[PDB]
Amino acid sequence: FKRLPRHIAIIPDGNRRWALARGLEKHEGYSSGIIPGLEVYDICVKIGIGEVTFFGFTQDNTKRPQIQRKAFTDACIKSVQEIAKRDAEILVVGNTNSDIFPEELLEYTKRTKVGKGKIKINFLINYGWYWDLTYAYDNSPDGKKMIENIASAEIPRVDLLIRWGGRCRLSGMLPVQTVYSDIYVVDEMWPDFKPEHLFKALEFYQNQDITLGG
Amino acid sequence: IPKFKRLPRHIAIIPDGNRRWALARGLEKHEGYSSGIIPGLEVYDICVKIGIGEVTFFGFTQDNTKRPQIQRKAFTDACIKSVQEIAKRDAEILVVGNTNSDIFPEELLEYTKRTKIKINFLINYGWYWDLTYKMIENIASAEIPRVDLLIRWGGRCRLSGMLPVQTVYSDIYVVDEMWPDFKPEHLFKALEFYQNQ
Ligand SMILES: CCCCCCCCCCCCCCCC(=O)O
Ligand SMILES: C=C(C)CCOP(=O)(O)OP(=O)(O)O
């Protein structure tokens, strides 16, 4: 590739529809979401992508049935643990002042180098856009302070956002970082991840006309 | 005009593609914007006809003002004309953007409080200006409600810093044709996409 995004955001959606289409229960797709994340990680390391942010689950996601919440929470926990067994600088962002936040992930709420490091991997866990923006409007000297102090301030601008499951929407992922993100939608559900999904998203990105500005 | 089961309460419009449209016709980059005015009129007419409650037009942003002077005059004049032409019609008009600047057209200052379908224009708007303006109720764009469907002409799939608060859950529909090549079926196809969610 001629041009590569510095930072890729991943919305690994489609897990419940994927399960249903296979004659499984809605809650049973999320565990088939783990290996795909691993492949996105391996391809990203291989091409030398600097940063990937995975949309794990939101505060909004937690109003779902308990059976689904346990399943997507456990799949998020396992994904982080599995990337932690690899070569990554891991960070987890989300509301830690809540029962819903998995204790297992508290040790990743400050960027943690694992193995040989290099690539930055972020997870949004018990994340919410409103929580993110208001975090700053606690006790900030000024407006110029607020944006530097959003809960996600450590996560830089997203160049390319890739969403599985055929919906073209952000679902409140990082409103500040996504203002100029090029958005690529994969029609396949996340558990049907294929490398060509990512290769096609990267071609889309490199095909953008850079004369056109923001 | 087809009939629809579901309709968005609020549609955002990013009328992009004006410069590429001009270039493909052998015109100068700045010379497409004026061909953007009638399309806005047609989106307004179709929206009134189906009884869409609110439409927000992306006019121009603080970022857009770092483009050449020849382009800035041309998009600023086309925005001014578009507001004036919707004002000649049956509409509750609001203009949001940074009025504390030379760049903000004096002609539009009278529309920076709602008059009397609701039609909003972003004029010298900036996402950073918007948020740094309790907080969430007091963003510069607080009057503009959540966007249900955002339609962008000119083939790019991105928000270009349009209303980060209101667009968090917006379904986004991209028309490949440039804005001056607007066709009614662009909007109809966007509305079918919306109802099929
Ligand atoms: C106000 C609606 C019709 C106006 C007619 C055309 C002039 C408006 C300017 C077009 C550019 C707006 C979108 C640019 C998006 C971007 O910055 O990438
Ligand atoms: C990652 C999340 C939150 C799911 C994305 O879909 P939405 O969040 O837009 O889904 P609904 O609001 O329609 O449930």
Residue numbers in the entry:
A (entry chain A): 6 to 219
B (entry chain B): 3 to 118, 124 to 140, 150 to 213
Show passages lifted from the paper.
MM_0014 from the methanogenic archaeon Methanosarcina mazei is known as a versatile cis-prenyltransferase that accepts both isopentenyl pyrophosphate and dimethylallyl pyrophosphate as acceptor substrates. Cis-prenyltransferase (cPT) generally catalyzes the consecutive head-to-tail condensation of isoprene units and produces (Z,E-mixed)-polyprenyl pyrophosphates. MA1831 and MM_0014, which are orthologous cPTs from the methanogenic archaea Methanosarcina acetivorans and Methanosarcina mazei, respectively, unusually accept both IPP and DMAPP as prenyl acceptor substrates. The overall structure of MM_0014 is in a ζ-fold, which is similar to those of so far reported cPTs.
The crystals of substrate-free MM_0014 were soaked with either IPP or DMAPP to obtain its substrate-complex structures. When soaked with IPP overnight, an electron density consistent with an IPP molecule was observed in subunit A, but not in subunit B where fatty acid was still bound. IPP was bound to the cavity opening of subunit A, which remained in an open conformation and bound an inorganic phosphate molecule. Superposition of the two subunits of the IPP-binding structure (designated as “free+IPP”) showed that a fatty acid ligand overlapped IPP and therefore might inhibit the binding of the substrate to subunit B. It is also curious that no electron density derived from a Mg2+ ion was observed even though the crystallization buffer contained Mg2+. Superposition of the structures showed that the C4 of IPP, which is the atom involved in the C-C bond formation in the head-to-tail condensation, nearly overlaps the C2 of DMAPP. In fact, the position of IPP seems unsuitable for the reaction. Because of the absence of a Mg2+ ion, the pyrophosphate group of IPP is misaligned by ∼3 Å from that of DMAPP. If an allylic substrate binds to the donor-binding site, IPP is considered to move deeper into the cavity because its pyrophosphate group would be coordinated to Mg2+ along with the allylic substrate.
